[PDB]
Design a protein around this ligand. Structure first.
Ligand SMILES: [Mg+2]
Ligand SMILES: [Mg+2]
Ligand SMILES: [Mg+2]
Ligand SMILES: [Mg+2]
Ligand SMILES: [Mg+2]
Ligand SMILES: [Mg+2]
Ligand SMILES: [Mg+2]
Ligand SMILES: [Mg+2]
Ligand SMILES: [Mg+2]
Ligand SMILES: [Mg+2]
Ligand SMILES: [Mg+2]
Ligand SMILES: [Mg+2]
Ligand SMILES: [Mg+2]
Ligand SMILES: [Mg+2]
Ligand SMILES: [Mg+2]
Ligand SMILES: [Mg+2]
Ligand SMILES: [Mg+2]
Ligand SMILES: [Mg+2]
Ligand SMILES: [Mg+2]
Ligand SMILES: [Mg+2]
Ligand SMILES: [Mg+2]
Ligand SMILES: [Mg+2]
Ligand SMILES: [Mg+2]
Ligand SMILES: [Mg+2]
Ligand SMILES: [Mg+2]
Ligand SMILES: [Mg+2]
Ligand SMILES: [Mg+2]
Ligand SMILES: [Mg+2]
Ligand SMILES: [Mg+2]
Ligand SMILES: [Mg+2]
Ligand SMILES: [Mg+2]
Ligand SMILES: [Mg+2]
Ligand SMILES: [Mg+2]
Ligand SMILES: [Mg+2]
Ligand SMILES: [Mg+2]
Ligand SMILES: [Mg+2]
Ligand SMILES: [Mg+2]
Ligand SMILES: [Mg+2]
Ligand SMILES: [Mg+2]
Ligand SMILES: [Mg+2]
Ligand SMILES: [Mg+2]
Ligand SMILES: [Mg+2]
Ligand SMILES: [Mg+2]
Ligand SMILES: [Mg+2]
Ligand SMILES: [Mg+2]
Ligand SMILES: [Mg+2]
Ligand SMILES: [Mg+2]
Ligand SMILES: [Mg+2]
Ligand SMILES: [Mg+2]
Ligand SMILES: [Mg+2]
Ligand SMILES: [Mg+2]
Ligand SMILES: [Mg+2]
Ligand SMILES: [Mg+2]
Ligand SMILES: [Mg+2]
Ligand SMILES: [Mg+2]
Ligand SMILES: [Mg+2]
Ligand SMILES: [Mg+2]
Ligand SMILES: [Mg+2]
Ligand SMILES: [Mg+2]
Ligand SMILES: [Mg+2]
Ligand SMILES: [Mg+2]
Ligand SMILES: [Mg+2]
Ligand SMILES: [Mg+2]
Ligand SMILES: [Mg+2]
Ligand SMILES: [Mg+2]
Ligand SMILES: [Mg+2]
Ligand SMILES: [Mg+2]
Ligand SMILES: [Mg+2]
Ligand SMILES: [Mg+2]
Ligand SMILES: [Mg+2]
Ligand SMILES: [Mg+2]
Ligand SMILES: [Mg+2]
Ligand SMILES: [Mg+2]
Ligand SMILES: [Mg+2]
Ligand SMILES: [Mg+2]
Ligand SMILES: [Mg+2]
Ligand SMILES: [Mg+2]
Ligand SMILES: [Mg+2]
Ligand SMILES: [Mg+2]
Ligand SMILES: [Mg+2]
Ligand SMILES: [Mg+2]
Ligand SMILES: [Mg+2]
Ligand SMILES: [Mg+2]
Ligand SMILES: [Mg+2]
Ligand SMILES: [Mg+2]
Ligand SMILES: [Mg+2]
Ligand SMILES: [Mg+2]
Ligand SMILES: [Mg+2]
Ligand SMILES: [Mg+2]
Ligand SMILES: [Mg+2]
Ligand SMILES: [Mg+2]
Ligand SMILES: [Mg+2]
Ligand SMILES: [Mg+2]
Ligand SMILES: [Mg+2]
Ligand SMILES: [Mg+2]
Ligand SMILES: [Mg+2]
Ligand SMILES: [Mg+2]
Ligand SMILES: [Mg+2]
Ligand SMILES: [Mg+2]
Ligand SMILES: [Mg+2]
Ligand SMILES: [Mg+2]
Ligand SMILES: [Mg+2]
Ligand SMILES: [Mg+2]
Ligand SMILES: [Mg+2]
Ligand SMILES: [Mg+2]
Ligand SMILES: [Mg+2]
Ligand SMILES: [Mg+2]
Ligand SMILES: [Mg+2]
Ligand SMILES: [Mg+2]
Ligand SMILES: [Mg+2]
Ligand SMILES: [Mg+2]
Ligand SMILES: [Mg+2]
Ligand SMILES: [Mg+2]
Ligand SMILES: [Mg+2]
Ligand SMILES: [Mg+2]
Ligand SMILES: [Mg+2]
Ligand SMILES: [Mg+2]
Ligand SMILES: [Mg+2]
Ligand SMILES: [Mg+2]
Ligand SMILES: [Mg+2]
Ligand SMILES: [Mg+2]
Ligand SMILES: [Mg+2]
Ligand SMILES: [Mg+2]
Ligand SMILES: [Mg+2]
Ligand SMILES: [Mg+2]
Ligand SMILES: [Mg+2]
Ligand SMILES: [Mg+2]
Ligand SMILES: [Mg+2]
Ligand SMILES: [Mg+2]
Ligand SMILES: [Mg+2]
Ligand SMILES: [Mg+2]
Ligand SMILES: [Mg+2]
Ligand SMILES: [Mg+2]
Ligand SMILES: [Mg+2]
Ligand SMILES: [Mg+2]
Ligand SMILES: [Mg+2]
Ligand SMILES: [Mg+2]
Ligand SMILES: [Mg+2]
Ligand SMILES: [Mg+2]
Ligand SMILES: [Mg+2]
Ligand SMILES: [Mg+2]
Ligand SMILES: [Mg+2]
Ligand SMILES: [Mg+2]
Ligand SMILES: [Mg+2]
Ligand SMILES: [Mg+2]
Ligand SMILES: [Mg+2]
Ligand SMILES: [Mg+2]
Ligand SMILES: [Mg+2]
Ligand SMILES: [Mg+2]
Ligand SMILES: [Mg+2]
Ligand SMILES: [Mg+2]
Ligand SMILES: [Mg+2]
Ligand SMILES: [Mg+2]
Ligand SMILES: [Mg+2]
Ligand SMILES: [Mg+2]
Ligand SMILES: [Mg+2]
Ligand SMILES: [Mg+2]
Ligand SMILES: [Mg+2]
Ligand SMILES: [Mg+2]
Ligand SMILES: [Mg+2]
Ligand SMILES: [Mg+2]
Ligand SMILES: [Mg+2]
Ligand SMILES: [Mg+2]
Ligand SMILES: [Mg+2]
Ligand SMILES: [Mg+2]
Ligand SMILES: [Mg+2]
Ligand SMILES: [Mg+2]
Ligand SMILES: [Mg+2]
Ligand SMILES: [Mg+2]
Ligand SMILES: [Mg+2]
Ligand SMILES: [Mg+2]
Ligand SMILES: [Mg+2]
Ligand SMILES: [Mg+2]
Ligand SMILES: [Mg+2]
Ligand SMILES: [Mg+2]
Ligand SMILES: [Mg+2]
Ligand SMILES: [Mg+2]
Ligand SMILES: [Mg+2]
Ligand SMILES: [Mg+2]
Ligand SMILES: [Mg+2]
Ligand SMILES: [Mg+2]
Ligand SMILES: [Mg+2]
Ligand SMILES: [Mg+2]
Ligand SMILES: [Mg+2]
Ligand SMILES: [Mg+2]
Ligand SMILES: [Mg+2]
Ligand SMILES: [Mg+2]
Ligand SMILES: [Mg+2]
Ligand SMILES: [Mg+2]
Ligand SMILES: [Mg+2]
Ligand SMILES: [Mg+2]
Ligand SMILES: [Mg+2]
Ligand SMILES: [Mg+2]
Ligand SMILES: [Mg+2]
Ligand SMILES: [Mg+2]
Ligand SMILES: [Mg+2]
Ligand SMILES: [Zn+2]
Ligand SMILES: [Zn+2]
Lengths: 37, 204, 122, 71, 59, 131, 5, 118
RNA sequence: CGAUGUCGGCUCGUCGCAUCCUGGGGCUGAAGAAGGUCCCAAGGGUUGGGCUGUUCGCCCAUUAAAGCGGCACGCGAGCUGGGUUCAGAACGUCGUGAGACAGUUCGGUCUCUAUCCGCCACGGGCGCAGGAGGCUUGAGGGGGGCUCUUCCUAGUACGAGAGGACCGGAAGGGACGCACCUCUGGUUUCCCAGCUGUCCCUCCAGGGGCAUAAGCUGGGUAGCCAUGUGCGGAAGGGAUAACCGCUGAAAGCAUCUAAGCGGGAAGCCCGCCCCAAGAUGAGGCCUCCCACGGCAGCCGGUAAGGACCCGGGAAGACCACCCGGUGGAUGGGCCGGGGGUGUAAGCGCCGCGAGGCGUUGAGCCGACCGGUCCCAAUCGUCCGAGGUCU
């Protein structure tokens, strides 16, 4: 899980979701998982 | 949850499977059920035990009436065992079998006014190298202007011991029922002749 | 009760005569070693042309203590010296002979070759 | 400067209340080689940091200029 | 030490509140059965010399 | 109650009376049941009784012997079940209840200070003449 | 008594 | 702590307290009754009773034992010939402490008499 | 600036979390093992040494780890005083000089008494609408909270091999904490013995004083103790963090989420141990006494009870607490046992003698376990309800 202030899509299969008040990027590539923080 | 009142007899050690077993001997039996606390009447469950018969010439009228409602001879000590409802009207050492684990509560030995070293295992001060009249002193007790005070609960000199202490999970080495003797492995709070309480362990 | 600074005689033929304990190899911060414990030690006195020499930092197991060891049977045993046998990192002795009696506690603690070589186990 | 560690601390010797409470002394450590240079030549940490880094560089230079010579 | 010292004069109210414990208690006295004189219990009567029903000392 | 009697009553099941009387200064052989890995064997520990501290059933005694060039002191409970038997090997005559001072004595020095206790040696020889 | 020098 | 310690100190070192009990013993065996402070009187009972009981035994050994404290052969002679016979059938309790009513003026000390029992 | 004592150490902590370790995770260029990196997590833990006044740093040997910071760079009415920071002296250096120096060197007075707050202990008072003796609930506090190694699973899964698991299960430690004194080991101010010099008793013998506030020496009960012994950290229930899901739209797909549901930390709540109804919100139960006499008040005499006084106590500074007070085993004595010391004196025998042998495990003998009214806790005195209103 990448934890950073700038979360973006990294590849075309990335998905930006907002769950539980936080921005996440989820993806079939597990490297691309991001949490904003 | 079973329990009984008793007196610390003294220590010795026995041999069992070619091992010295330090034991404390307790005289626990017998304890007559004097009152049972019930949820209906008292809001909780407990058995008020008696222990040691007392010279009825020394038992005032409020207490005599209390024993009378139980049909029980006057007794020196009344203690409740909490959450215990024995079947009979008497509790004896038989409630314990060798191999069980018990909790023992007693009144520790009283150190009186105790120094910071005896009471709290403080290091004290040096004994040479110029140490000036502080060899057993506690050192600093605070900071400076912030917070400008001393915490509650600060470890200081004061009275030590003669307080309720419970030592836990002691092995019942033997039960000699004809003498109302319980043998427990290890050490038990307080002096010989002290009152103790023997409950089933809460350790699992 | 062996601790840093403590001197021990050497009950083997490695050539070391006196080692000085510098560590009790027993967890984070053991205060003392007794029989069967291992120490790290400096070699303070040795006979010429031995296995180990003065100044070496070595490992050894304690085999005798002047502080009496107590036993589950209720007995105890006490020696006139503090003595140790120099070992390697596999716990085996580095000399071929063990001088003097050793505590039977060593058997219980896997120092069998030492127990083997000692002329008396007590 | 990423392979360099700079320690600051109180200096030794005279100064009164100043030298007691001031982090004027500096050590610079070349982390790969381990060689250090210290400086409390002045009263100022910044001047001692500057002078210490100079001497450290000059010394690592002579070390580099000397292995080059031995080759 | 550094010679601690009262920071303020103690008020008349405070010093007298300190002394709220200083009143003497009167001495415990029982009548001597022999001569009826008041004297401390468990002491030989200093008036008639009696204790425990008999004479113990001259007076 | 009588707390002393209760403790003596607890202890009485573990008390022995088969062992011979001895005194500090006597040479004694304790045959001691010792477990070794798996089995148990009897190991003889023979030496001078340098101390008997008494406390009823809790009496213990200390025996000293020079073993392969090293002094060894073993401390024995007098009522331990691990003791097979104690044989009196010799009666020595001492002047004090505790013989700590023999740790710093030479061989002849102990020989001189703890001499054969003829009286109790004759008492031992007169007994065993009860056939 | 030491000094604030 | 002083737990289960027997024996009063009376703010005297070991030899002063020993000499104190000896001298109070001499005065008591001499006059039969002496006044002293309450704590001293209580401690004196056992010191003197022991010397009287040994006198009741009467052997030479006891006499020399009593002599170590009393030092006075006349007083010991009075102890064995006059004092001790009075107590042949008495099993201890040879001394009596009763407390006085009025304190010492100059220091407030509570006083008591110590006497040999009849 | 009519003074806010300045470094380091010591002592005692306490807090933060940007986490050194231990617990939980995601990613990995994660095969396993071991690491990297980031996230959650402050409950606990965070060693001993060499050098230097050192802080700092380096080094040695270990460790799960050897965290970083705040608290007047925490803490000198708590200690230290090596450094700094006066007066002496000296070196280098500067100055004609007197002298001078974040240059060096050796030396150099750190103040018995705590009033108020605060803190640790402990009482006194009143209150808790009758007066009392017990026994209690637990609001609310506090304590505690660490971790390692080996073994089995299994030399298995994984790996070419070297190496080597998860999960689960046993065993053994280190440090710390509480209590304890059976054992081990201390102390043991007079419990025993031995020894010198001197003076004395009483000449011998036997003893006493003094040589320390034990003359010295060898021992040493109880107690108080650690180095010794027992036991503790949990288990378990609940709710969570990061993180992982189930079902699922908005948004035909997808989505841990917007409705709802799971799983999930040494942390959080409970659980454990201790305090605790001044919890003035002053609680509950069992028992006892009871409508007394005189103009929600007063005045006495009483009740059940209590206090005073006394004998004491592994309780204790005083106070308090606890037991006992002649219907008594509470202290003291006496007796028996334990325990210590280690064979008393006197006598007889052997020796020229110093001595030795026997009587003899004798004599002495604190406190420990008991017995016994021999001595003392005599005799008493004073308090102390009559119960507001709806
Ligand atoms: Mg970017
Ligand atoms: Mg997706
Ligand atoms: Mg108790
Ligand atoms: Mg209790
Ligand atoms: Mg107590
Ligand atoms: Mg204790
Ligand atoms: Mg102290
Ligand atoms: Mg301590
Ligand atoms: Mg303590
Ligand atoms: Mg210390
Ligand atoms: Mg110390
Ligand atoms: Mg000192
Ligand atoms: Mg000083
Ligand atoms: Mg001071
Ligand atoms: Mg001093
Ligand atoms: Mg202090
Ligand atoms: Mg201040
Ligand atoms: Mg300060
Ligand atoms: Mg403040
Ligand atoms: Mg108390
Ligand atoms: Mg406790
Ligand atoms: Mg267990
Ligand atoms: Mg059994
Ligand atoms: Mg019985
Ligand atoms: Mg050797
Ligand atoms: Mg050798
Ligand atoms: Mg050398
Ligand atoms: Mg060399
Ligand atoms: Mg070897
Ligand atoms: Mg940096
Ligand atoms: Mg500085
Ligand atoms: Mg310096
Ligand atoms: Mg200057
Ligand atoms: Mg100077
Ligand atoms: Mg500054
Ligand atoms: Mg001071
Ligand atoms: Mg001061
Ligand atoms: Mg001072
Ligand atoms: Mg002052
Ligand atoms: Mg003022
Ligand atoms: Mg004032
Ligand atoms: Mg004023
Ligand atoms: Mg006024
Ligand atoms: Mg005034
Ligand atoms: Mg006041
Ligand atoms: Mg006034
Ligand atoms: Mg006052
Ligand atoms: Mg008054
Ligand atoms: Mg006992
Ligand atoms: Mg020999
Ligand atoms: Mg001889
Ligand atoms: Mg003989
Ligand atoms: Mg004390
Ligand atoms: Mg006390
Ligand atoms: Mg003291
Ligand atoms: Mg006593
Ligand atoms: Mg005395
Ligand atoms: Mg005094
Ligand atoms: Mg005095
Ligand atoms: Mg005085
Ligand atoms: Mg005086
Ligand atoms: Mg003296
Ligand atoms: Mg006289
Ligand atoms: Mg007269
Ligand atoms: Mg007088
Ligand atoms: Mg006097
Ligand atoms: Mg006596
Ligand atoms: Mg005669
Ligand atoms: Mg009286
Ligand atoms: Mg006067
Ligand atoms: Mg006066
Ligand atoms: Mg009086
Ligand atoms: Mg100023
Ligand atoms: Mg002023
Ligand atoms: Mg001012
Ligand atoms: Mg001022
Ligand atoms: Mg801190
Ligand atoms: Mg964080
Ligand atoms: Mg972690
Ligand atoms: Mg982890
Ligand atoms: Mg892995
Ligand atoms: Mg790999
Ligand atoms: Mg990771
Ligand atoms: Mg992350
Ligand atoms: Mg933490
Ligand atoms: Mg370190
Ligand atoms: Mg050195
Ligand atoms: Mg150092
Ligand atoms: Mg340093
Ligand atoms: Mg430095
Ligand atoms: Mg490491
Ligand atoms: Mg690790
Ligand atoms: Mg500071
Ligand atoms: Mg600091
Ligand atoms: Mg400070
Ligand atoms: Mg100071
Ligand atoms: Mg300071
Ligand atoms: Mg201050
Ligand atoms: Mg100050
Ligand atoms: Mg202060
Ligand atoms: Mg101040
Ligand atoms: Mg200085
Ligand atoms: Mg100085
Ligand atoms: Mg000046
Ligand atoms: Mg010059
Ligand atoms: Mg000029
Ligand atoms: Mg010039
Ligand atoms: Mg010049
Ligand atoms: Mg200059
Ligand atoms: Mg200068
Ligand atoms: Mg400078
Ligand atoms: Mg200098
Ligand atoms: Mg110089
Ligand atoms: Mg200087
Ligand atoms: Mg000097
Ligand atoms: Mg002073
Ligand atoms: Mg005050
Ligand atoms: Mg104030
Ligand atoms: Mg206050
Ligand atoms: Mg109160
Ligand atoms: Mg009510
Ligand atoms: Mg009421
Ligand atoms: Mg009550
Ligand atoms: Mg009561
Ligand atoms: Mg409760
Ligand atoms: Mg609570
Ligand atoms: Mg409150
Ligand atoms: Mg809590
Ligand atoms: Mg924990
Ligand atoms: Mg395997
Ligand atoms: Mg498998
Ligand atoms: Mg392998
Ligand atoms: Mg496992
Ligand atoms: Mg802790
Ligand atoms: Mg403790
Ligand atoms: Mg204890
Ligand atoms: Mg004992
Ligand atoms: Mg002991
Ligand atoms: Mg011992
Ligand atoms: Mg004596
Ligand atoms: Mg003499
Ligand atoms: Mg003579
Ligand atoms: Mg004289
Ligand atoms: Mg003198
Ligand atoms: Mg001297
Ligand atoms: Mg003497
Ligand atoms: Mg001694
Ligand atoms: Mg000793
Ligand atoms: Mg003792
Ligand atoms: Mg002892
Ligand atoms: Mg003891
Ligand atoms: Mg203790
Ligand atoms: Mg310990
Ligand atoms: Mg443990
Ligand atoms: Mg745990
Ligand atoms: Mg859950
Ligand atoms: Mg769908
Ligand atoms: Mg889905
Ligand atoms: Mg939802
Ligand atoms: Mg959930
Ligand atoms: Mg799941
Ligand atoms: Mg409670
Ligand atoms: Mg209440
Ligand atoms: Mg309560
Ligand atoms: Mg109110
Ligand atoms: Mg109300
Ligand atoms: Mg409230
Ligand atoms: Mg109310
Ligand atoms: Mg109430
Ligand atoms: Mg309730
Ligand atoms: Mg009361
Ligand atoms: Mg008292
Ligand atoms: Mg009191
Ligand atoms: Mg008073
Ligand atoms: Mg008192
Ligand atoms: Mg009073
Ligand atoms: Mg009473
Ligand atoms: Mg009465
Ligand atoms: Mg009695
Ligand atoms: Mg008695
Ligand atoms: Mg007494
Ligand atoms: Mg005996
Ligand atoms: Mg004996
Ligand atoms: Mg003889
Ligand atoms: Mg004789
Ligand atoms: Mg003779
Ligand atoms: Mg003779
Ligand atoms: Mg002759
Ligand atoms: Mg002889
Ligand atoms: Mg004896
Ligand atoms: Mg005597
Ligand atoms: Mg006697
Ligand atoms: Mg006796
Ligand atoms: Mg005992
Ligand atoms: Mg009777
Ligand atoms: Mg009366
Ligand atoms: Zn992607
Ligand atoms: Zn009268």
């Amino acid at each position: 899980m990448k934890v950073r202030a700038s979360v973006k899509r990294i590849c075309d299969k990335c998905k930006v979701i907002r769950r539980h008040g936080r921005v996440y990027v989820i993806c079939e590539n597990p490297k691309h998982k991001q949490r904003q923080g | 949850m079973k329990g009984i009142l008793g007196v610390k007899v003294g220590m010795t050690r026995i041999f069992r499977d070619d091992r010295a077993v330090p034991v404390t001997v307790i005289l626990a039996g017998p304890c007559p059920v004097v009152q049972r606390r019930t949820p209906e009447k008292d809001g909780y469950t407990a058995v008020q035990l008696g222990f040691l018969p007392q010279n009825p010439k020394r038992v005032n009228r409020p207490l005599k009436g209390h024993f009378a409602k139980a049909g029980v001879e006057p007794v020196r000590i009344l203690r409740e065992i909490r959450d215990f409802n024995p079947e009979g009207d008497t509790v004896t050492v038989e409630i314990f079998k060798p191999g069980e684990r018990v909790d023992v509560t007693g009144t520790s030995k009283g150190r009186g006014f105790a120094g910071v070293m005896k009471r709290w295992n403080f290091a004290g001060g040096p004994d040479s190298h110029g140490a000036h009249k502080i060899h057993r002193h506690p050192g600093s007790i605070g900071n400076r202007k912030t917070p400008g005070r001393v915490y509650k609960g600060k470890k200081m000199a004061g009275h030590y011991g003669a307080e309720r202490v419970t030592v836990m999970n002691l092995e019942v080495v033997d039960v000699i029922p004809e003498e109302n003797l319980l043998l427990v492995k290890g050490a038990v709070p307080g002096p010989n002749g002290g009152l103790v309480i023997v409950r089933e362990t809460k350790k699992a | 009760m062996i601790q840093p600074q403590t001197y021990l005689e050497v009950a083997d033929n490695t050539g070391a005569r006196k080692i000085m304990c510098i560590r009790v190899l027993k967890g984070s911060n053991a205060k003392y070693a007794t029989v069967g414990d291992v120490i790290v030690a400096s070699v303070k006195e040795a006979i010429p042309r031995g296995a180990v020499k003065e100044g070496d930092v070595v490992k050894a197991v304690v085999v005798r203590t002047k502080k009496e060891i107590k036993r589950p049977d209720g007995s105890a045993i006490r020696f006139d010296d503090n003595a140790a046998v120099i070992i390697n990192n596999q716990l085996e002795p580095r000399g071929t002979r063990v001088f003097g009696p050793v505590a039977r506690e060593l058997r219980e603690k896997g120092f069998m070759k030492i127990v083997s070589l000692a002329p008396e186990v007590l | 400067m990423d392979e360099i560690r700079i320690d600051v601390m109180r200096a030794s010797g005279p100064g009164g209340q100043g030298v007691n409470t001031t982090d004027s002394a500096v050590r610079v450590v070349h982390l790969p080689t381990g060689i250090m240079v210290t400086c409390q030549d002045s009263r100022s940490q910044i001047k001692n940091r500057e002078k210490a880094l100079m001497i450290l560089r000059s010394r690592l230079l002579e070390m580099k200029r000397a292995e080059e010579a031995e080759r | 030490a550094k010679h601690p010292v009262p920071k303020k004069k103690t008020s008349k109210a405070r010093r007298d509140a300190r002394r709220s414990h200083h009143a003497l208690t009167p001495p415990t006295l029982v009548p001597c059965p022999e001569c009826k004189a008041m004297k401390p219990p468990h002491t030989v009567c200093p008036e008639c010399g009696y204790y425990a029903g008999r004479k113990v000392l001259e007076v | 109650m009588n707390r002393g009697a209760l403790i003596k009553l607890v202890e009485s099941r573990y008390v022995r009376t088969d062992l011979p009387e001895f005194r500090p200064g006597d040479t004694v052989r304790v045959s001691y049941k010792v477990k070794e890995g798996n089995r148990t064997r009897i190991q003889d520990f023979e030496g001078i009784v340098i101390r008997i501290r008494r406390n009823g059933f809790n009496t213990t005694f200390t025996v000293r012997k020079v073993s392969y060039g090293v002094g060894v002191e073993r401390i024995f409970p007098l009522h331990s079940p691990l003791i097979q038997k104690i044989d009196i090997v010799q009666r020595g005559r001492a002047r004090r209840a505790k013989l700590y001072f023999i740790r710093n004595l030479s061989d002849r020095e102990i020989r001189r200070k703890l001499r054969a206790d003829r009286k109790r040696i004759d008492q031992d020889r007169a007994a065993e003449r009860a056939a | 008594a030491a000094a604030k020098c | 702590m002083r737990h289960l310690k027997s024996g009063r100190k009376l703010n005297r070192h070991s030899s002063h307290r020993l000499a104190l009990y000896r001298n109070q013993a001499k005065s008591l065996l001499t006059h039969g009754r002496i006044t002293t402070t309450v704590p001293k009187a209580k401690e004196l009972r056992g010191f003197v009773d022991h010397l009287i009981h040994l006198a009741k035994r009467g052997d030479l050994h006891a006499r020399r034992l009593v002599l170590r404290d009393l030092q006075d052969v006349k007083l010991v002679r009075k102890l064995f010939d006059e004092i001790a016979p009075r107590y042949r059938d008495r099993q201890g309790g040879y001394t009596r402490v009763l407390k006085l009513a009025e304190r010492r003026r100059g220091d407030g000390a509570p006083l008591a008499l110590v006497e040999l029992v009849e």
